[PDB]
RNA sequence: AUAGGUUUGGUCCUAGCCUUUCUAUUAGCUCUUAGUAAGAUUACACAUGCAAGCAUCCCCGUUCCAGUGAGUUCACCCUCUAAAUCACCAGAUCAAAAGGGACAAGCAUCAAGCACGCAGCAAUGCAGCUCAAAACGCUUAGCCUAGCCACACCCCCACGGGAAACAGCAGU
């Protein structure tokens, strides 16, 4: 069996259900938490479980840790902009900092899809090329065309070595 | 069984066999109902539930133990000693 | 003025019509099979799950639209008379841009006489295919669709079938695809087999269908011996709604033609066999009767 | 804005201060190692200018990409000290606090 | 590999196998290989009729058109399946070609009625 | 891996080796036909033939294509901005040089490198910078394949020298 408690945490699987992507402007995400105190809890388990997968939906903003800096655990987010985004969250869970962190510097649902419009747009099905980027390398493929040579022998008529032939 | 003749070892194995039957619940009577883990001595299984039709992947013993059984679909791992008593 | 087939009205009494049957739309599908996945619900729990599998079955029964045959398309965009003889094969050229909608797509054809004529439905429909390749459609039409094939399909019952490999292959207003799903609807007609249909989202065409070519009489013999009466009001009700000067229209207008009544109308007038309609109709009656006291 | 240094910002720790008018900071990432799915701290030194010299070890130190490097490694510049070593005053309250313990009570305002 | 000089470039890159040519209109930098690299795909054609007797021609027409404004040339065969689209006007020695064709057909009648 | 054989007088466990599967090269024996794909072992030396012209002279091209893998974290992203195309322009496209970040395998019996930093306009001052989270070093390898990087007989380079160059096609 996979090492260590919760070893769900360390399968893609479980760091692809992350849903907080944070807007390009955020850059750095600083979490002062306390390793102890009943009131801590929510940012000690935040930290344990959601931040994995913060960072890997995010793999650009620098996600740094602060344990018993500061009498009561919070983030701060650095944006682009020089502006700084504290982040109460003491007494909150886990899910309900997620959920803020969401709100209030995640992109939304929109936007991903957007995202996600923009990707698929290259993707052209009639282009043709190596199945790495095409649906299919010839128009051979495509029922009704001329089939490859290389399964369905062409015509004498028109293979060249007997237009050589007819020319002679 | 055990005895110095290969017939009489025969005899007693399938007979000392039918008074020590187990029943194996099977789901729709085709599978097992989850998947099993164990570690059996030095000999681990991974038992893994499987669809209709999926067939026994199974090593050869569990293969003619399932089929035995009445186990027709499920997937079947061993891992350290293979010991087939184990 | 008629109502169309997708009005509000007529998509209420189509969707009630066709039923609701989860089991029936969600037969186990015969496919690759992964391992069942299982939970523990309480009885609130399952019932929101139903629930949900209830609109999921609704979303997966919305209904095809019904649309006109589509007119040939003869266009001419250029007679270039130089380039005759200069070739001896068409040249089929496809605008492939991604976000233009496929009903929008330029594909124009340089015949050998040098026209450039708009391509026909046929080959907008085999280019498209050719170059965005759709799930469940073949370039060459398959076979199953000549009629000794059909008819092999609608033996074996496979009606359902033969309607989905239909929408599959062709476009709603394709003429393959009319033909296709007007001899699906007379096979149904003619064996009696309307319950397969139901709790399918090709109910609603083959009732249109029948509506409109006035012939509800064996779908609502059905109807009755199935003791669905409610649907059976519905339809005949649709029915005098799509015909309005039908004579049995004008009698269910003048007389209070409000539940059976409708049924009885129509089984007088405009019903080609009223007489076995009203023979059902008695048996219904004696079968309300055999359990009202 | 416009400036040709990948990191816009960074935060870190200063870990040395021996040159003159420059901090020495540890900014460490989490990285993910590809086998085992687990994040692990990447540290990296980065050299910031600093021309209050203010800067000292242990400092959690905030830093911005200069619009070029003023030096062979000098790419950064100290625009925050975010928690001045001992003297970090919580950005909650605003109280000034050791640790855990409020140096001054919340309360007393 | 750093090209000195060059230009995009409108052309049929060839794929297929023997006997069987095939085309992929690619925006392709010139000086690159012909089946190499290329900047992005507008379509294909397929020169050898298939069992309706067409030559299928994909052209990405927005994307065509984008690159053209962007500046990329057009290989001549390109200028050619544009004009037999209409897309553009038919290429002089399309319809030059089409009259030495008329003027040899023509002596050749005269040649089959002289006998 | 659905595993199998093999330690012992015998059993259990641990463990190595090997078998079964799939490719590619070579060899042995053997071989009828047609379509298609692919094809020196070597960065050793080369006979011979050909491989770059066009065009009313100027210009343009011969820097491309094609070739090899000797060397090797010049390949990817961002900033900036050359060259080139958009008939002149326009910013658009493409993309050098420069800056920032990322970027192979093995050996730590390669553990120290020896100036590898900073400040200042300069003068000059500070004494620092990298490194067991692998610096410095040795050996190996073309790579992350719509293709990309490097080399072009050797001296990294190529003024110069060694010398007379197929790693262009065919061929030896
Ligand atoms: S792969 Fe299509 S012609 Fe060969
Ligand atoms: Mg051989
Ligand atoms: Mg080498
Ligand atoms: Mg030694
Ligand atoms: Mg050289
Ligand atoms: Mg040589
Ligand atoms: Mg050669
Ligand atoms: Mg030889």
Not at chain 1, 50 to 67: D, E, G, L
Not at chain 3, 57 to 66: F, Q, Y
Not at chain 3, 213 to 218: A, E, M, R, S, Y
Request: glycine share 6%; charged share 25%; net charge positive.
């Amino acid at each position: 069996p996979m090492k260590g408690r919760f070893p769900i945490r360390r399968t893609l699987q479980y760091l692809s259900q992350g849903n907080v992507v944070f807007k390009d402007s955020v850059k750095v995400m600083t979490v002062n938490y306390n390793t102890h105190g009943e009131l801590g809890e929510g940012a000690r388990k935040f930290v344990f479980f959601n931040i994995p997968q913060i960072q890997y939906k995010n793999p650009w903003v620098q996600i740094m840790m602060f344990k018993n800096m500061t009498p009561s655990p919070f983030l701060r987010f650095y944006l682009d902009s020089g502006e700084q985004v504290l982040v109460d969250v003491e007494t909150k869970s886990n899910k309900e900092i997620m959920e803020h962190i969401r709100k209030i510097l995640g992109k939304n649902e929109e936007t991903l899809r957007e995202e996600e419009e923009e990707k698929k747009q290259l993707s052209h099905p009639a282009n043709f090329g190596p199945r790495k980027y095409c649906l299919r390398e010839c128009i051979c493929e495509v029922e009704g065309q001329v089939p490859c040579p290389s399964l369905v022998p062409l015509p004498k008529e028109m293979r060249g070595k007997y237009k050589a032939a007819l020319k002679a | 069984g055990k005895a110095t003749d290969r017939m009489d070892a025969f005899r007693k194995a399938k007979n000392r066999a039918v008074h020590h039957l187990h029943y194996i619940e099977r789901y729709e009577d085709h599978t097992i109902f989850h998947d099993i883990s164990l570690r059996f001595k030095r000999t681990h299984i991974k038992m893994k539930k499987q669809p209709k039709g999926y067939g026994l992947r199974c090593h050869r013993a569990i293969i003619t133990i399932c089929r035995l059984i009445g186990i027709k679909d499920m997937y079947a791992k061993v891992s350290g000693s293979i010991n087939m008593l184990s | 003025k008629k109502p169309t087939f997708m009005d509000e009205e007529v998509q209420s009494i189509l969707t009630k019509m066709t039923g609701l049957n989860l089991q029936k739309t969600f037969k186990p599908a015969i496919q690759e099979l992964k391992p069942p996945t299982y939970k523990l619900m309480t009885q609130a729990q399952l019932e929101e799950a139903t629930r949900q599998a209830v609109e999921a079955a609704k979303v997966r029964l919305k209904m095809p639209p019904v649309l006109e045959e589509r007119v040939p398309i003869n266009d001419v965009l250029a007679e270039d008379k130089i380039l005759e003889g200069t070739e001896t094969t068409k040249y089929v050229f496809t605008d492939i841009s991604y976000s233009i909608p496929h009903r929008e797509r330029f594909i124009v054809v340089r015949e050998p006489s040098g026209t450039l004529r708009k391509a026909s439905w046929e080959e907008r429909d085999r280019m498209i295919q050719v170059y965005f390749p759709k799930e469940g459609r073949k370039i060459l039409t398959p076979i199953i669709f000549k009629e000794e094939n059909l008819r092999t399909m609608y033996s074996q019952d496979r009606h359902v079938d033969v309607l989905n490999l239909c929408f599959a292959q062709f476009e709603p207003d394709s003429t393959e695809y009319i033909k296709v799903h007007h001899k699906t609807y007379e096979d149904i007609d003619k064996r009696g087999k309307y319950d397969l249909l139901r709790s399918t989202r090709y109910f609603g065409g083959m009732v249109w269908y029948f509506v409109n070519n006035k012939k509800i009489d064996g779908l609502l013999i059905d109807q009755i011996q199935r003791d669905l009466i409610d649907d059976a009001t519905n339809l005949v009700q649709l029915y005098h709604v799509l015909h309005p000067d039908g004579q049995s229209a004008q009698g269910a207008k003048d007389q209070a033609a409000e539940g059976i009544n409708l049924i009885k109308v129509f089984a007088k007038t405009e019903a080609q066999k009223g007489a076995y309609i009203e023979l059902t109709l008695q048996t219904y009656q004696e079968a309300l009767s055999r359990h009202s006291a | 804005v416009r400036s040709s240094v990948h990191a816009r910002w960074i935060v870190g720790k200063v870990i040395g201060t021996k040159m003159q008018k420059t901090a020495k900071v540890r900014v460490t990432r989490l990285v993910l190692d590809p086998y085992l799915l687990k994040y692990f701290n990447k540290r990296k030194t980065y050299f910031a200018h600093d021309a209050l010299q203010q800067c000292t070890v242990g400092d959690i130190v905030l830093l911005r990409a200069l619009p070029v490097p003023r030096a062979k490694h000098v790419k950064h510049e100290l625009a925050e000290i975010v928690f001045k070593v001992g003297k970090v005053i919580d950005p909650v309250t605003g109280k000034p606090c050791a640790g855990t313990t409020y140096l001054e009570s919340p309360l007393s305002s | 590999k750093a090209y000195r000089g060059g230009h995009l470039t409108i052309r049929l890159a060839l794929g297929g196998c023997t006997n069987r040519p095939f085309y992929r209109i690619v925006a392709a930098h010139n000086k690159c290989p012909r089946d190499g690299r290329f900047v992005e795909q507008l379509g294909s054609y397929d020169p050898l009729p298939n069992s309706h007797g067409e030559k299928l021609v994909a052209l990405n027409l927005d994307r065509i058109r984008h690159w053209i404004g962007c500046g990329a040339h057009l290989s001549k065969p390109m200028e050619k399946l544009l004009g037999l689209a209409g897309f553009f006007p038919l290429h002089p020695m399309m319809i030059t070609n089409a009259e030495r064709l008329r003027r040899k057909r023509a002596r050749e009648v005269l040649l089959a009625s002289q006998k």
